[model samples]
Target chain A: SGFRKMAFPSGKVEGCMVQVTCGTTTLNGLWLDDVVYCPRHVICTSEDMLNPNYEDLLIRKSNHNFLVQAGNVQLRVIGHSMQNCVLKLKVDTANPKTPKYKFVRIQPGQTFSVLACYNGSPSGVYQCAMRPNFTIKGSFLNGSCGSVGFNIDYDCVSFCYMHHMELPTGVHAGTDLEGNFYGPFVDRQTAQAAGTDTTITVNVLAWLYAAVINGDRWFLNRFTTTLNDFNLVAMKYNYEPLTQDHVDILGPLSAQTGIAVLDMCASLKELLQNGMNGRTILGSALLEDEFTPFDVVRQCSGVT
Target chain B: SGFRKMAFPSGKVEGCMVQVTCGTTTLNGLWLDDVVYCPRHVICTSEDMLNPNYEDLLIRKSNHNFLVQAGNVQLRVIGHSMQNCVLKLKVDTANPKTPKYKFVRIQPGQTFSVLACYNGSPSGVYQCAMRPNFTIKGSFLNGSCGSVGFNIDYDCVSFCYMHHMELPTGVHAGTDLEGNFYGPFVDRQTAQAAGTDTTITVNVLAWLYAAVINGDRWFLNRFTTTLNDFNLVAMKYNYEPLTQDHVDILGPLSAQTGIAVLDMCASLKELLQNGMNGRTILGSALLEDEFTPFDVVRQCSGVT
Candidate 1:
């Protein structure tokens, strides 16, 4: 549990391990001060498929609810997908040197992510030097670093597979304010072609910030039934509220897995209302002196 | 679950089901009537690599703990390796008409195994027909039956990779009233050259009956794990005190996975003591019912 917040090439960094392996080691992430966060997902992979790193394929192939179908991309999520599913990235020929903030706080959520190729990278050093096609692109993301991207040359065009966009709460690709089913989309153009009534003239701040970029096939796939020590640390001590909306976003993700992540699941819900102001970050030391996560959970049986 | 234990070329089979695919199906096994019971472990494997069935490779390769090494020939496993550990075989030419009793029980125990290549074989059937060059000159195992002979084409000689065995009080790789390790040995001349402790003298029941006749690697590795409800019905009701020693032997195999099978793993201990008694004969049916293991496990929980 020993954690720390330090300065990086991007901005303020917090309670996150940088290069954790997905299945074996701790989960890794790209944390920046406030703009954006990219969560990384690692899955098994073929030896060598393309120019980009294997992590790209790991992300692409994961049941992270992100997959493509040429013109009409589909999102088959396991947990929850962002309502206004949006985030754009492309070939940044101009600023090939920019390092993007790789961060996505689990927020009272599960470890399921659609993400990176990092061995927790240079400690306390949030600096990457890669290309646009190799990074998650969006205006809100940090612009100083860039990690490698997916080799999507075959089926996708210019990597718009995850093009960003804003959407209405009712007609998007995710659960709504009411946990309603919105899609398996009928593609925007295809829907119009097929004469379908598609409009959720709902509120601008429609509870679940979701969207759909018809062509890019990519969108946010985020949700969870519980929040473990990892997510708890991220959302509270590390979170820098982009806006006030995330407090509301934290609700369902923490709905409940009931698996018991140290009896804090309830406390987490109550405290996460502010921008990660929930728990006080004391920078706990874990996995350092031979103390493992398994050991801790097995030993920490104290529950009120 | 419907199941029926019927006749077999080997002799007779009871409570056992047959024709199982290792990778594709759930791990299953059968408790035999007084021969030996087969405990099976499920790991991953590719399809077909040699003349003998790949399950031999599957067994040798699993951490299930049974392995053989010809003097210079060591066990090098982890993905495909039969290419190097090559040997061919089938029903032997001299005694093509012999039936090896295929058995070993899970009896309350550890993951460490002394097991089978089963999903129990073709119903009421024991037709085998499989090989490699590794040497072992152990005496008790290979009778005129030729079922337990390791084809010693050449040799680094003497099998020692699988040694250091002891049993009693049932916590083990295997156990007996005594704690000793029997092993696959080298031919005398080869043994002299090898300078290893070559002993077939420990008693035919020398504790942990061990050997590796290369040829019969073709015969077994065929059975399932799930016994029909009928098998469960017969076992506890039919078993009797075999010998005093079995109680000790049964102590460990059913050590403590503690999954609980109709008070099994315990009965297996008592039953396995006399080789594999515990039951008379009456096959059963399962996997046939609309109900399934996964289905049962899943249904037992109300998702709604």
Candidate 2:
């Protein structure tokens, strides 16, 4: 479809015009660099936007959270066709094995977060074509204006999360790595405290990097992507990993020594025993073998 | 009435026994020294004592504030007859000109603060005889136990606000000094910001010290005490200062030249023009006269 570019209203600050009384006027730090890196969580809320008078749209820079205050004030968050848009990850109803990334279009009072992955990996950014088609042809706008019959559709901004991590082969990508049980990545001083099975839950992407070689064929083919974002799927919906039953299906397909999957789980235990080093999953070599090796394997697909 | 001394229950920490669950176990600094000085604000609450399970009785040591958490837990604040007790200042109904101090007793869910003055200075600590006569003859005990049919009478502690400040005679003490119009005193770094008449409100005690001699008879006799705490009456209930009308009554009493009071008000303006120095009221000499001089005059009471 052909799309046309339109000029934003005059007096707008890069498509945003804000009026706050006795309130703070600052955006979160993640947006400061205009490039939100991976392995970070983003939260968006309309609680602040619901009441604009004497309210503050406080955004946490450290965690990339946004709160829009409500009131009788005008709010705008504009988007354009030429710019990279935020994507939402969801299950590809047509082909459940491959997750799909779609444009995130929040309506008035609607709150949601963006999810994306790269190289078609469950850990990369989705290209901007997924952005919703706007009536303005190439531009998107959302804020109090929509509710008040103005020129915006929603009242929020969209950002991306880049995911790249070390992980043992055979383990599911998103689901297995996204459990709160692992807590957050710790500094060197607190590594000793993460020694137990419970606290050793890992920094997902970090563990992935520690185990799987970046473009290993075996890693990609053996472990497929899920239909939904890991955080939304496992945490919000409590969906079990599809690979939970994969061991049975893939088991019969492998030769007598079908401990490849078992070895992957073992690698995790090994990592826990030695602890994590931000990026390195210690003791990863202890579990390497014929089916599962420590270093990256050639060919990006699962196997020949 | 005669009072006898009695030993507190055994196992009590100097007449106090507390059991806080995962909550802070620290008393306010005012109570730390076993002596609460004046010229400070005190706030007491029983919100925490009502639900003690996960409640925290947060006490601000700097400003002397206490909050008793609620729920099923033991709480104690004990007072001994032999020790100086907290006093509450109230109106002397029979003699409106003189205020009276009494013991402060907090019930299970009741919260209140203590008010006192020393050297009969509106800014000194009141003596201990004002403590309530307890069943233990000389001891005061209060806590959650009372509400649960235990030994304590209340679930809180009492502290005082001493008031001593230099001020030109004739202005009402509490009412005029307690408006939110004046934000907290600023440090030297921000003093320049306080140049406007709107922000130039004087610090109560500091301004008083600058205008009046410490033991000036004119100050003691001319300025009568109020029936309630200044913060409570003016800030809480919005009660106008009785002296608001005193100027009118005293105006007729002063000869044709009734500007004694007018000059006092002018002294305040002069101090504002010169600025405050934590304690000194700058430019105070600009408003001094026979009726309201800068130096200490003979006798502590108003002129005979």
Candidate 3:
């Protein structure tokens, strides 16, 4: 192979470009065509992939989960009916005699969290393993752990679960929308695919409209910006823009889940209220400084 | 080439198992060993990819951006510090001719959008390019019919971006936290290689977060989800939960360009918000859907 030119991103090949000409047959480099080639160590192609299935494109899915930060510890129980389970947490603190021991009974619908998981600052929040692990002995009023402790599993990939209905569904898929992929819509034109973790997800604007107007916050807040993008455009179409009066609704309404459980919302809201990023077109006045995300949210949310 | 076994998703190579085995040395599809293969057309993996260098991830980021749904037409502005750009959008409507003409001055720091792009239900919105294309005259202000109508460029890609602030720095590569490829961080710790996106996106997370908190809502909304993921985690370790009293100062505050001018945001935002898929977690508490994206705003400013 003479001056073998390769692509930019990446790919793997076992030999030389087909049909043209070359000397190497070994996977010494990657090949797309005679015009494109790169060393086996080089990566070509600009396309970023997280799963052709578009898995990474949506939410409710991720290999990683949330990690408890320093001084903060929490017990989360996710399983079927079986309740009255008691969880005991332990951590190797400065004092071994008293390894951070905290026991709390997880009822049917509840999550218990400790304000702190570590002793140091943010960086010190996470430990490699079981540093602050735990175990649950009984599921029912029960097993009594038999005086034994069950290794409470810990993972923080992404607790991408449902918690947006007025009643807030737990960390599983929803009722009306489960098991419908490939079976739900009549055609590609009829279906709404969001790629949700256990349930479903939507990455389309029309579909989001289909959902939002349908009114459900169960999707990932992670895609909020996208939501806003489609939303802003559609907003221009005939929707009302955010004005001072709109602030009343610029937040979550009290639901059975309580306005309190609106974690992402609170986050989104706080982000807005904080008056973070400025705007390029603030009240018809262009600023030397560009707009901030909060500004967009506020303006879009009808912020003042 | 003899025995060639092939898998399937969709591709092209031609022929069957060649060589001896199925007798195959030619896989006919994609593979590690030339002896065994799958259908050529089918995609071999699901993990999305592309270096953090930011390649074809969005619309201008192509074959990737999400598509807009039924009847949603909005204008978006992008490209180096753009100026008064006149974009003429032409998508075959029941009635063409009097195409959609919207003009505004793209300021030093603002995206010009037309509240009204079309008049129709859904079918009338988009019909794939070439259906209606046009010409553009200029990108400046005073146009004396020197009037070159710029056909609206459209594509809805995930506008993944940043919006976190727990960290003050980015990285060349992670350390104890980064190197722990497969240690005790169970459940998902064993997965940080960009061979996957989410895990690695965390790197992107901090970066986007840098922008968001720095104040760049003007960027991509689609990317915000990824932004939120990383941000949420980082936030969880320190911030308050959804409680109303939880309104803390959220978002990027400052930067050189202040993060607002982050160009790709509009392109990304428009792409996603404009849409690419139907969401499952539509209404409240609807965990039935999710949108998984391996997005990360690489510019999380201040990222060390």
Candidate 4:
């Protein structure tokens, strides 16, 4: 059962936020407080569901081993939604011999990749089954295979694993002298909260480091002329300013510095190597108080 | 000055392998005792060279940052050799402020990538300059830019860094529970002597592990139906037979085992994760007495 009709909260529907408790986890979403809402489509039921289609939720790969995050794994419906029904998530593997479920309702092209599956296991395969009774429609669920559902294998790895497929081969996660680990993430909060639950955030430095290592002109071209806007800066130090020493280590603004922008990358590659060798001083110092070194290095590159 | 003509050491040139001592390092090459020879082409000179062309030696990247290996950085001449002249290598950057040089004589399409620059520095950019005087010919050195030359920035990194650009992102070097490190390498010997020098070798497992991590169906398709030949087995154990425990851990044969061959990949990915988590029982045991875990995991997969 969905939320019941109640007195209009905030005296209006605009800016309405709702929180729901499901077993051990809490789910947050938007709601129109004024509307009488009990979604007609129910793709799952139970004490727990045994069949619910989640083909849309699958992070498919041509290699056959689909990837999934333990926490908020996003799903979106292309072309159109699953008719009147909603999609369901089920944990097929858990250590304590229990089942967990999460539900999502999406319209055409709607993405819930930002939503988290708080009840997901740290690592394992998951099942996405279609409900036993449903009149499936829309291109999203038109195939006979939709009802049969499918399974996806996933390893809830460090956030770094999430982006490894996109990076060049040699670039990977590393720990600083202080045992601080760094890898790719969506943002500072997600990077900070890495190894916790799946709350996705983004960052720039990790990608920058990877790009520098690869000498990826295409990737670097994006930042070569862009301004060091608040978003890029906030992605690293939260909202703090750059350190004096960091500024010094970045070197004076030269032809390659503020203009051509390859010198900063050189310093980044050099410092990253220094860190890998366990020598800090400038190396570890560069990553100080960063949202993982991944974001810090980018900020370091752009700080100039 | 090069070596002087002297009495042939061996009765004939059939099996002649001569070694020449140049300053602190020794150079070895195939010598034909039947002929008195001196390579007419000399692209560099002086007690230490100041100008040399190494354009051919550069590992070019489109992003303007060229890559080079410190030692055994192979050089090849395509179309034809620099007419009557041999290529020269010089240490443009070195600690203690001194210069070192190595010379290579090559013909069209000859590859000296397998040779070692014994006196090369651990890390630094090197110069390959052309001599001031030369009757240069052949398509190999027709351009005037060959004389002006260019520079390549190089880092004498761990063998793993050599292949990062080619791998799928996220796959990187990692240490096992015992603190032993592993990454991509050419073969067991090169993998064993990873930190030693740039003595290049080859391997199949590291590539396979990366392919598995990425679910690279194209890569896995190659080994899916191949037999475990002597080369594959020797690559890890150096001719030693597989351990009983190794065989046991490989699991019994099934449809997915020796035939379809994906279960082996699953176990490999699982153990790699276990190793990353610092919880290696079967993981550490699996890598024992092998060339970096890179080779061991591949053997673990094929042992089936």
- Which is the winner by TM-score between candidate 2 and candidate 4? 4
**Which portions of model 1 show Cα errors greater than 4 Å?**
A1-238, A242-253, A258-304, B1-40, B43-304
TM-score of candidate 2 relative to the true fold: 0.16
lDDT of each residue in B63-153, candidate 4, tens digit only: 1121122233322212112222221222222222111211232211111111011112110001111111111111110010111111111
Per residue, candidate 4 scores C-alpha lDDT tens digits across A5-78 of: 00001101111122222222232222221211111111122212223233432222121121222223332212
Residues A23-126, model 2: lDDT tens digits = 23221111111221111121222343223221112222312222221123222222111011111111111221111222233221111111111111111000
Judged by TM-score, which candidate is best?
4
- Minimum summed lDDT over a 10-residue window in model 4 chain A is located at A1-10
Task: Tell me the lDDT of model 3 at B217.
Answer: 35
Residue B232 shift from truth in candidate 4, angstroms: 24
Instruction: Determine which window of 10 residues in candidate 2 chain B has minimal summed lDDT.
Output: B1-10
| Interface DockQ of candidate 1 | 0.01
Clashes of 2: 71
Residue A154 local lDDT, model 4: 21
Local distance difference test, per candidate?
Answer: 0.20, 0.20, 0.17, 0.21
Q: Could you tell me how far off, in angstroms, the CA of residue A276 lies in candidate 4 after the best superposition? A: 25
Report residue B235 deviation for candidate 4 (angstroms): 26
lDDT string, candidate 3, A38-118, tens digits = 111111111321112222222332211211112233212121110111111122222211212222222111111110000
DockQ, every prediction: 0.01, 0.00, 0.01, 0.01
DockQ of 2: 0.00
Worst 10-residue stretch by lDDT in candidate 1 chain B? B123-132
